[PDB]
Amino acid sequence: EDITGTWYVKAMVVDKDFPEDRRPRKVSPVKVTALGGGNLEATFTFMREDRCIQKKILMRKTEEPGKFSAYGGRKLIYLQELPGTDDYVFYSKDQRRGGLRYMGNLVGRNPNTNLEALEEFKKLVQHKGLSEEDIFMPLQTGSCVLE
Numbered sequence: 001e002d003i004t005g006t007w008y009v010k011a012m013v014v015d016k017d018f019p020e021d022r023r024p025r026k027v028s029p030v031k032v033t034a035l036g037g038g039n040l041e042a043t044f045t046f047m048r049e050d051r052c053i054q055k056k057i058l059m060r061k062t063e064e065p066g067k068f069s070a071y072g073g074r075k076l077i078y079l080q081e082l083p084g085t086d087d088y089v090f091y092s093k094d095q096r097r098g099g100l101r102y103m104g105n106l107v108g109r110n111p112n113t114n115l116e117a118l119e120e121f122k123k124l125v126q127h128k129g130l131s132e133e134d135i136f137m138p139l140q141t142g143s144c145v146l147e
Contacts, residue, residue, distance in 0.1 A: 001066055001079060003040060004032045010087070010113045011106035013125050013135045017099060024048060026139040030107070037061065040068065045143045052144030079107075082124065085117040086110065089124060104130060111140060 007030040014023070026047040033041050038061035045054050059068040059077060068077040075094040082089050087108035094101040106113075106121045122132050 003079065004034050005109070006031055007107045007109065008111040008140060009044075009090075009105050009107055009138065010111075010140075011118055011121055011135060011137045013104040013121075013130050015102045015130060016134060018101065018103070018134070022048060023136060024138045026141045026144065028141055028143045029111075045145060046138065047141075047144050052147075054145065082106070082117065082120050084120050085114065087117050087121075089121065091128070102128075102130060104128070 009027050009030060012024065024046040028045040030042050030044040033043075035041055035058075040059040042057045042059060043055065045052060047053070057070050059070050060073075062069060066079045068079075069075065070077060074096070075092055078089075078091045080089045080091065087106055090105040090107050092101075092103045092105075094103070104121075104125055106117065108117075118135075118137075122135060125135065126132060
């Protein structure tokens, strides 16, 4: 794999327990930087209603390539190539106080999206038990720290 630099979140999917109020309306580019020892850090912002939310996530190496962990292993994070296109899928499993949470994100180097890529995302998403009608596409923006 290769993982550091800028990524763009083009589509998003969430399990059916995920509250609608909780969905990102907007989202910045994701800057991924290495910290030595294989460990990474992703930085980004997104809008949840009128609220700008800032994230900075330590992603620790694991014995499987493409698989990472965050928040002490509370959350597991897989990066997989999305076949037939030049994008990847960012799949997360989060052992949250409130239950196990699944979440998928279509990510790519190029900020543009092809409909065929969204379709492969949907297909792959459905394979994993998640649903098409819970696929949403937040607005791509700069940081919301400006406003």
